[PDB]
């Protein structure tokens, strides 16, 4: 602006503004502030008209892609786009960020939260937490079961350390387990400082059986069943991660009543959260 | 911090040397005669046509009704005089074109035999240019060659 | 607070200082843009940062 | 130094529409632009006759 | 703006006339090589000619406008940098008072 | 660059190597006129520029309205009034350094220090 | 970079040169064409010691041009290899004599075995124009940049490991991936088309995901992984990327009235 | 020197009503010049009687402007130049 | 130096190749694949320093298990070229060298290109087919990149199985193109379908299928 000499790059010349809307603007400043204020408006105007048009196009592209009654995603013609919808066949609305408590932290803490020992002593389960605990100590039919599952969670860690390569420990997932735990606690009053009435065999098997009933896919063909293992592959990895025996016993301290009502629920809500078919 | 107007109440209240004579040349000779001004572009110091070459030869080188466009006479006359003026030998050659920029306000002081002078208006000026001196011309000979 | 207005002005000041300082550094021919951007463009990022951060 | 002109008054860089905004120097420019459009369909009394 | 009007322009003849009688040598006679620093003089995009001392020339033009002799619509720019003097008498330009 | 023009033709004097004398001439490709080679150079490209950065400098330079001001002396006159501006090479990547001009003797002097 | 030589600055610098396009003209100062009648003794005084100490039949049109120290240092080079290139570029026909690294005046000249001066002009052009001196085509401003890469600590946690990253502008995916010292398994390109043609549709699709999820992430909002993942899997169903345009899918046999 | 900005406001001009009517008038005046000439040509070419009112069709202009105001059509070749005035409120 | 730069680039390319045919199914011991640069030099660089592409090419035979799933898979030869551009007559030796040996298919690895006419000589021995590769492209095993999920051929029988489990025609599958590298890396053919194990974040594992067009 001519009210200045040339080569004057000074902040106030090139268009700083160092008052604030309270104490008014000085002609040069005011003019300047018009400049940017318009620039937004132009941008707003176009950035809509590009958006409105753009968005319209994508509508016609993905115009009729539907989920047919096999959880596979093909246009009118039938050209299969996605073999399992969204790659895991869960509807959108029933997702929540939840935490993958097997992938963060150290092995040390990992063990510490998970590693249960009966023959030896190192991470000895304290028998008080449940009835059988006293005579459990040093048994063998069970100790193996620990070694079995605890192996698996590690095989879930190598698995997940890979899958997410940056150790992100939160993801969208179907049914929020966390609340299911809490509802339980606050519907049978986990009266702490007590032995519970759940056996190690109560825990692991009922879980095993649980996983077998999150039927995303209904077939019986080694094709269909394959996807099933690879549908819930993650959502299981969480579930086991949560319901590690120690955790359930040591912290959540469920009863029989709590535990079955829980599992029966996780089934139910999951089945809701299945992507519906016929949804465009 | 207000708006005040009646200050009309205030404002109406606050209110050696050598002579060399001249002569406008007789007019009859002008009436019969046309003279004009030569200019050259030779960049030669004087280029006196005396030392140019001889000889010198300077010269220019029933139905129904209809609509005629309209022009002023001097333009038609001068347009008609499109034949460029050419002085020759039979050896070098000179041609020029009209300039129309500086023919208006121009009177000449003929240094007569006397120290006096006469004043003579300017009719035309021309700009003769030497040409064909190194005599290369390829009218369509380099033209068709050009497209290469 | 009438006082904290003072400090705003101080923060305004340091900027201009932080702005004026930089400027001569370029005119002294004594500026290095790091590898990738010209003298002037680096001069810009040098400045405009100083302004936004000061305002902020 | 070498001033050769002084503005008559800077508030004379506004259109008809703008100089009806009070304190157009305290607002956020697009507001003004919005205001500019709006009076033109403010009702009033357009012409006394 | 409030304080804007438009040049409804005029004839440029009297203007040219002035510079003619005022040292604006005709163009045709321009010989640059020997007159390196002539200031070009334009009118309405018509480069009429050149000049050797524009400084006085300019101010003379100013007063001659401010006298009201030249019409005030006339806008005269002296690009001191480019030895170019520009002048416009055009109908359709936009100007304001200072 | 810096190439002569014919005489009595005034046309550009192109290089013509003399093979006999083992040297270069310069001719009017319009006429006969030719002339020898006075500088063993022929051409040059000179990609870089630090030329002209003082354009517009006139002994009438101060009369400009809007070059702002300072006080440094003439490195010759010791005359401490002068006016400044920036590199006339209004190229992109040019540096900022400021060109000053004495107003006693128009003495040019810039403001960079790394090389005078 | 190489995972061993990851966050290793020198290594980063060692590659840093290796890929940045370096044309001849990018660095040369000024070129003067000339006349030295003698094929042996150079007209200008100075170059002679560079003649004999090379000279310890030819054309006289002695082309001269100059390098800057700094940029010849910025892209650290020597002018032997340059000519060795230049010689191998043409032949052993153009006799190229280079001032040495010890020389303050980085000057290099040549001569050849109508008017030769004009080919030289053609000749000196290509030299400046199309002779890269090193670094891949189309690639300039090998811009360093430091990042954190959450590696697992040897303990079980992650830690924000710092490291050096080679930014760039231009894309020659093919060559760069083949450069020694880099890590090909993890090469990411701003434009995905290359990726497809270089790494096949499934990478491209995956790369396309990367490219979309950025845009939303840049903004700040979040959209379910479902949706973009669905869209991305439309375009690449026909095999090979597909625009979403007139020419994208209306060029598919997908119902007329649609 | 830099590339010219084509938007520096000084390089603009505002063809206000005056110059705009000129365009409209000037061209429309041609349509007069041609026509009389045409009729003039005919009457002689057939020795008819030279009458003025047939010779000049006045509508040629009056109809031209009145239309070309009434709609911003300006020939076609241009529109958006004439509006109804906006008498909402004084400032409008 | 540049020869030395070459040698690695050859060394790499060789190593890459081993893996290629290691993945169509053939029998190549892990260590063999992974001889360091040094051995490569002594084994195939001559005395002075040149490597012999002529005695560095070789034959392949599927692992028996490869044979097990696909009865057709036959021995396989691979060839490089010493000509930095490939004469027809030179590859005339090749195809008939195949024909004598009768590999079921065989794969050429030029360094720049071939006399165009010889590619006319290529699709010439049905059933036995030829695969041709820039040495240069083979420098980096694109498969090894992050974004290359696994792929596998299928027994037609498996592919046969698939549709009848989803009730599909071959046509409305998602596709790849024979042009696409991963095809070329696998040597795909019209209608060869590919299970693509993909490590997909919303289920950990997602698998897809394309049909080589
Ligand atoms: Zn000549
Ligand atoms: Zn001085």
Swiss-Prot record, chain B:
It comes from the Eukaryota. Phosphorylated on Ser and other residues by TAF1 and casein kinase II-like kinases. It is found in: Nucleus. Present with 1920 molecules/cell in log phase SD medium. Belongs to the TFIIF alpha subunit family. TFIIF is a general transcription initiation factor that binds to RNA polymerase II. Its functions include the recruitment of RNA polymerase II to the promoter bound DNA-TBP-TFIIB complex, decreasing the affinity of RNA polymerase II for non-specific DNA, allowing for the subsequent recruitment of TFIIE and TFIIH, and facilitating RNA polymerase II elongation. TFIIF is composed of three different subunits: TFG1/RAP74, TFG2/RAP30 and TAF14. This is Transcription initiation factor IIF subunit alpha. It comes from Saccharomyces cerevisiae (strain ATCC 204508 / S288c) (Baker's yeast). The gene is TFG1. The chain holds residues 21 to 415 of 735 of the full protein.
